[PDB]
Amino acid sequence: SQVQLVESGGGLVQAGGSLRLSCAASGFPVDITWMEWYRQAPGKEREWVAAIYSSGQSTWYADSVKGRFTISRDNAKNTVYLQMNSLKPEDTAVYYCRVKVGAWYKGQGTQVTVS
Amino acid sequence: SQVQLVESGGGLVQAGGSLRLSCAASGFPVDITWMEWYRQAPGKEREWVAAIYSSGQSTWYADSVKGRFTISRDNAKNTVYLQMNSLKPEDTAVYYCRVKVGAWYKGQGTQVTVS
Amino acid sequence: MITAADFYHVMTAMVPLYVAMILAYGSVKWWKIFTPDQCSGINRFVALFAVPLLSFHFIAANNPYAMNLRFLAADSLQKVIVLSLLFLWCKLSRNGSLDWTITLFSLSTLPNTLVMGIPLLKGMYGNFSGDLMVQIVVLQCIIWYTLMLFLFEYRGAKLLISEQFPDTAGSIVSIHVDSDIMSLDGRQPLETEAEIKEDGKLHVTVRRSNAMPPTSVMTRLILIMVWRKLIRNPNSYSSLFGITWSLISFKWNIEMPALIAKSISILSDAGLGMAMFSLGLFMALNPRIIACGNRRAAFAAAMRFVVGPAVMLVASYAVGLRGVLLHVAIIQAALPQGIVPFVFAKEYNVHPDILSTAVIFGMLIALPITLLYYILLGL
Amino acid sequence: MITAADFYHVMTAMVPLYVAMILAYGSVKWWKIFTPDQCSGINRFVALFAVPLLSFHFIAANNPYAMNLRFLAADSLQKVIVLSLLFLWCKLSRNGSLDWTITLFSLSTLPNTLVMGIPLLKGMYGNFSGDLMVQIVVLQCIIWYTLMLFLFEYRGAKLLISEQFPDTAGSIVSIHVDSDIMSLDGRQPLETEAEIKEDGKLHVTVRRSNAMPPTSVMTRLILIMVWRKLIRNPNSYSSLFGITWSLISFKWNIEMPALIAKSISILSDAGLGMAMFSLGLFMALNPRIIACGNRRAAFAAAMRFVVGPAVMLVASYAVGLRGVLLHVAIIQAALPQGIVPFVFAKEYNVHPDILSTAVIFGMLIALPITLLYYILLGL
Numbered sequence A, B: 001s002q003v004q005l006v007e008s009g010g011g012l013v014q015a016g017g018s019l020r021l022s023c024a025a026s027g028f029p030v031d032i033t034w035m036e037w038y039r040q041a042p043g044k045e046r047e048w049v050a051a052i053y054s055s056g057q058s059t060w061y062a063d064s065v066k067g068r069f070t071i072s073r074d075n076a077k078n079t080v081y082l083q084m085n086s087l088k089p090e091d092t093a094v095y096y097c098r099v100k101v102g103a104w105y106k107g108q109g110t111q112v113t114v115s
Numbered sequence C, D: 001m002i003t004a005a006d007f008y009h010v011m012t013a014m015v016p017l018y019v020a021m022i023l024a025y026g027s028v029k030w031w032k033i034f035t036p037d038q039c040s041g042i043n044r045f046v047a048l049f050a051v052p053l054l055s056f057h058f059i060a061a062n063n064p065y066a067m068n069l070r071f072l073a074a075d076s077l078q079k080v081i082v083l084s085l086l087f088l089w090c091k092l093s094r095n096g097s098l099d100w101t102i103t104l105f106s107l108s109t110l111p112n113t114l115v116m117g118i119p120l121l122k123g124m125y126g127n128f129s130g131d132l133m134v135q136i137v138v139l140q141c142i143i144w145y146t147l148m149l150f151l152f153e154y155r156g157a158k159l160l161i162s163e164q165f166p167d168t169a170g171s172i173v174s175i176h177v178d179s180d181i182m183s184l185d186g187r188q189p190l191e192t193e194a195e196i197k198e199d200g201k202l203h204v205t206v207r208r209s210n211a212m213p214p215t216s217v218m219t220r221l222i223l224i225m226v227w228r229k230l231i232r233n234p235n236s237y238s239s240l241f242g243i244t245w246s247l248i249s250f251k252w253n254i255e256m257p258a259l260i261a262k263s264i265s266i267l268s269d270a271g272l273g274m275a276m277f278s279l280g281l282f283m284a285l286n287p288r289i290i291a292c293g294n295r296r297a298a299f300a301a302a303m304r305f306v307v308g309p310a311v312m313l314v315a316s317y318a319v320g321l322r323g324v325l326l327h328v329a330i331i332q333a334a335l336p337q338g339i340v341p342f343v344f345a346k347e348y349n350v351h352p353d354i355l356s357t358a359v360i361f362g363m364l365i366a367l368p369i370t371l372l373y374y375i376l377l378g379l
């Protein structure tokens, strides 16, 4: 009945800034299981970045972005917040959430671009 | 040209005696390689007992007759002497030599029988 | 009454079938000649080379402009009366699923017509039975092995959506399948992914994993997962060129040239003997003959030799087959179970143990049961 | 001169042979369908079931009381002139062994007559060539695959005594072989043991290991090691019952009954197509076509298409074959190399690389060479 995923926080910024990404959800019974965050480069590839899930104290990261990006889930507002710091210039790619309610639901709404 | 293998030493004796078996050969070029001594029971089977060969300081023995029977080769007289001590009563079998000149040559001549 | 010569002409064309089967069953269990890894070598050959060149020889010789259209209706009336009653069962009862609908359909209205049915009925009612038994082989390889192929895809395309979209199954528009997938089964991990659009439209993409919808949507996902299962099946290339040559040849009276006709007749003559030799190897790879139990093995010969023929005895008074055509229509339904309905149940795992019993146990009683129908119709 | 129809009747019965071979060569190297472990499944089937039932059908139909005894002498004169000259080479020269005598004999006087020779010559000189080409198949499967079987045992029974009895080889009376051994080869360890008697008599027993003699002695050891290689070979049970039925049937005019004749004709028709399909798999299991080198692959086609036929051109003036029988005798010697002379050279390791070349390279030039002999004899 018109299920909705809302993304916010992105934009254009220079190198060395800070952004606060978001992924708001509404209209699900459970909506916890295993959520992700990943990039989508203009060179056709896609690297999985961060994940928070039902454990909460376990985050699966990559090697290049290891220990530098902050992930946080709000179970009350049904929103996962993504804080990113020391933004490298290779961030022209689109960065969005991959919520999972048993099957993977996704959106596309950001314009993350770092000069 | 009438090659000849001569065996001697056997006979009938009670338990606890001593016998001196022999295997004399004549008419070969080399006649060293790997010689044997084995039993032939009336229960159709045959257990390999002792062996002296080109090394000389290596004798392959069995488990039941281990370290109790004396083997000795005479390279001059072309005769291998077999001294046996503490003769067990299960020695009704025929005990003879198995000289090897590249193929296995054998005889049959003894009457080893222990009551 | 009958003669003793008619009993002899049956044994002339049924004894060379069992000789080619006992030598296959004997040379594995008794003398241990073939390794069971090497046993897959012959079963690979018969499925690809012998049978699709054997079915091409019967279809491209059968006249399409003189098919007995009255006999062809009273066999398309068995497969509709049985198909209408089973869908009345799976949608009104309290325990009727679709996993029992197809299995109770392959046991009843799909005999072994090509390999075994043609030489038996040729040795019972002259040579015009040898033309009628080809006219059913054409319809099985072009309709009734295709309608059954949709019923396994619809069995699969319902599970993958109902397992993983239980809450918002009603607002999906398009479904996109990557070309890696050949069978949405659960054999492969099948990471399912769903795009979200603005006004409730919801694109769904089915992928490969590393490390109810509208009926205008299910009738697109199925037709993609049938076109990928039809251009790989070699028998679909046999019956396509068989009908196309037969519509050309029997109008302008063109006879097929001897350079091509003898090029196919060197493998097609190696098709009927090897098929009974490949089937004889199959009845020794199993651990037991009766696998699922003695309470369901007799159920196989209850929905095949009774409910099979006796529904054509009432589907032949309606169309108007009497005399000699009535006896040939009843006997061709009491033939043992075909092998192509097993091949489907082995891939999709829809009861492989029942159809593995009905083929092997069906062959061992196929002779002394159809001979009872030859006697009781001759009086 | 000739017609264009005679060129057509050759291609009618030679094109279906190469179609059954290209599909075997293609489906391994190009499309990779068969696993090479499963490739041994079909080669196990053709050696045991297809061929010994195919050779039984030709021998038990051939009339023995009307064999062309003049044609049967001018093919037993090729295989004696060649066999007399090679033993003059291995006993007078300075480098003539016996390991080169047999290999220079199988390349010259043993063509492929059963599978490929019969359909070619039937399509060139009417139907009486189809009866003559069976009358050579009988003599190959009963004499010239048996005299060659003694020459591999005498190659083996000389090595085992001359290696391990170099000094007292002249005073051995009897040789006893245990029933474990099937081939005194060196494949098995073969502990040799010699009893000693009183007056120079020397019994020898050949065993299995765990963890010159008088000519009245060598002609007993060989006849034991041939009787053990003849009651296991399935083709020796084909030609034995083939001749026995044919001597009965063509005197009292008994025709073979249709229950038995159709029992064999379901496997024998699956024999000629499968043999060319099994041979096509063999020309892709090898790493290279030309294996031992380009200086000996052309030697194979030098002792097979030249020294083979041109010694029958002088062995036919002597017997007195002119006219039409002269052309059929020359062409049947230029056929490509048989497969049974390879089977021997693979077991006994007497040059397996040369005969593996001459079979495969012999098939690829068999057609454009015998067609040259059809033209040059027609002028």
Ligand SMILES: COc1ccc2cc([C@H](C)C(=O)O)ccc2c1
Binding pocket: C043, C046, C047, C051, C055, C112, C113, C114, C115, C235, C275, C278, C279, C338, C339, C340
């Ligand atoms: C591996 O053994 C097989 C495979 C496929 C077969 C197909 C057929 C035809 C198409 C049919 O009877 O309906 C017959 C026998 C067969 C044996």
Ligand SMILES: COc1ccc2cc([C@H](C)C(=O)O)ccc2c1
Binding pocket: D043, D046, D047, D051, D055, D112, D113, D114, D115, D235, D275, D278, D279, D338, D339, D340
């Ligand atoms: C595994 O392929 C074979 C094995 C044996 C064969 C025998 C023959 C006959 C006996 C012959 O030609 O002389 C033909 C072809 C054959 C192919």
